Design a protein around this ligand. Sequence first.
Ligand SMILES: [Zn+2]
Length: 287
Amino acid sequence: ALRIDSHQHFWRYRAADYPWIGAGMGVLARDYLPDALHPLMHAQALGASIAVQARAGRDETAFLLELACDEARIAAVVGWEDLRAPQLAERVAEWRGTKLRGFRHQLQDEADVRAFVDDADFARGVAWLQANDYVYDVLVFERQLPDVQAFCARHDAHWLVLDHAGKPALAEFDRDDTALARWRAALRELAALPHVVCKLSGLVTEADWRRGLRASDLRHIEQCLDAALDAFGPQRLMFGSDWPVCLLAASYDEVASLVERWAESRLSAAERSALWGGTAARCYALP
Ligand SMILES: [Zn+2]
C-alpha cells in the first residue's frame, strides 16, 4: 500500500519568480530540493511524494520532471502549461512517458476567477486534459468556491482535485461565525460531484501563522477535517503536506501528526490506508 505525500513543492529560490512569497515569509526564501524532503518523508513512513507546480511556466514543468525523471521517491508531477494555447497537445508531448500526471493553474490569483474558468479556450484545454487522463488541481480561496462550481460540474471526464480543502478561512472562525458555515456549504456543493476529490493539506497556513499557531487553531482544523470527511467520504480524502509552504506555520512532522491523530480517531484502518496514499494512487494513476 503506497504511502504518498500528495502535495509538495520544490524550488531553487529567486525572489521575482515566486511573487506569492512576500513579506514575513523569509523561511521560504531559500532552496527547497528533494534532499531536504526525503528525511521528512522517511520519518513519516511516506514512500513517495507528488511535486506540484509552484509558479506559472513550462520551465517549472521541465524543472519538476527533471527532479522526478529518475527519482523513485517522486511518484508524479502536477505541471503547468498554458491551457488556453492552441498548441497545448504538441507542448504536452515533450512530457510523454514521464511522471507528469496532471496540471494546475493558480486560479486563486486571478481577478475574475469565474471569467477565467468559463473562458472558451481554457475550457478547451481542460477538456483536452481530461480526454487524455490528466488530473486538474483546483486551487482557490474559499470565497472563490462558487466561482468554480459550474466549471467543476462541466469538466466531469476525469478527476478534479480540490487543493487544501478549498482553503477555509480558519483565521476568521472566531470573528466570523459564518466563515465555517459558508465554506461548508460551498464544500458540500462541490463534493456532490463524484469526479471531485479533496486534499487535506495546507490547513496550518490558513490560520494566523504570523502570530503563531495556537491550540484553538488545531481544533478549527479538526472541524474542517470532519466537514471534509462528511462531505467527501473517506475514499476521496488525500493527505498532502504542502511542504515547504507549511513551514510558515508548522513542521512537516506537526503537519502529518495532526492529520494522523485525527485519522486514528475518525477512520478505520482501511480508510486510513486510502487517506495516506490509496486515494492519491488511484486518482493520479500511480504504480
Ligand atoms: Zn529519466
